[PDB]
Amino acid sequence: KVFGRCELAAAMKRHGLDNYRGYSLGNWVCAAKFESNFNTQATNRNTDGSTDYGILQINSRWWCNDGRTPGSRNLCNIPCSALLSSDITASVNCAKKIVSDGNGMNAWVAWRNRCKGTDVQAWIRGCR
């Protein structure tokens, strides 16, 4: 599923992301924009052999199992395919674990590079 901007904002708000760990709803939408382009089925293979899955490009080395990443932790205890469903529940539940690892949203390389410090307010523009 390719989410609309406001569509993911309401989907992320409902699931508990708005100001989760002090990260305004804008930061998550912004992250999901530069990670997956609001596409839930986004899959990106990293250089280390692992793969990023879903709306928030969650890595398969630490957070989910794709069976093709030796040393896979599966800390969210889910198959990486579950991070590609139209329902972003799995992705949010795990993102809450990722953003609580200590480094916060810095875990998302796109967020730190394209969102952090920026006017993330603008991502929930006109969003009802």
Side-chain angles (χ1 to χ4, degrees), residues 2 18 21 24 32 67 94:
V2 171
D18 56 308
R21 293 271 173 173
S24 60
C94 184

Coordinates of all heavy atoms in Angstrom, one line a residue, residues 2 18 21 24 32 67 94:
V2 N 0.5 2.2 -0.9 CA 1.2 3.5 -0.9 C 0.3 4.5 -0.2 O -0.7 5.0 -0.7 CB 1.4 4.0 -2.3 CG1 1.9 5.4 -2.3 CG2 2.5 3.1 -3.0
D18 N 2.6 9.8 17.6 CA 2.6 11.2 17.9 C 3.2 11.4 19.3 O 2.6 11.1 20.3 CB 1.1 11.7 17.9 CG 0.2 10.9 18.8 OD1 0.1 9.7 18.7 OD2 -0.5 11.6 19.7
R21 N 8.1 8.9 22.7 CA 9.5 9.2 23.0 C 9.9 10.6 22.6 O 11.0 10.9 22.2 CB 10.4 8.2 22.3 CG 10.3 6.7 22.9 CD 11.2 6.5 24.1 NE 11.0 5.3 24.7 CZ 11.8 4.8 25.7 NH1 12.8 5.5 26.1 NH2 11.5 3.6 26.2
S24 N 7.4 14.1 17.8 CA 6.2 14.6 17.2 C 5.8 13.8 16.0 O 6.6 13.2 15.3 CB 6.3 16.1 16.8 OG 7.3 16.3 15.9
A32 N 9.0 8.1 7.4 CA 8.4 7.2 6.5 C 8.3 7.7 5.1 O 8.2 6.9 4.1 CB 6.9 6.9 7.0
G67 N 15.0 -14.7 7.3 CA 15.7 -16.0 7.1 C 16.9 -16.0 6.2 O 17.5 -17.0 6.0
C94 N 6.9 -2.2 16.2 CA 8.3 -2.5 16.2 C 9.1 -1.2 16.2 O 10.2 -1.1 16.7 CB 8.7 -3.3 14.9 SG 10.4 -3.8 14.9

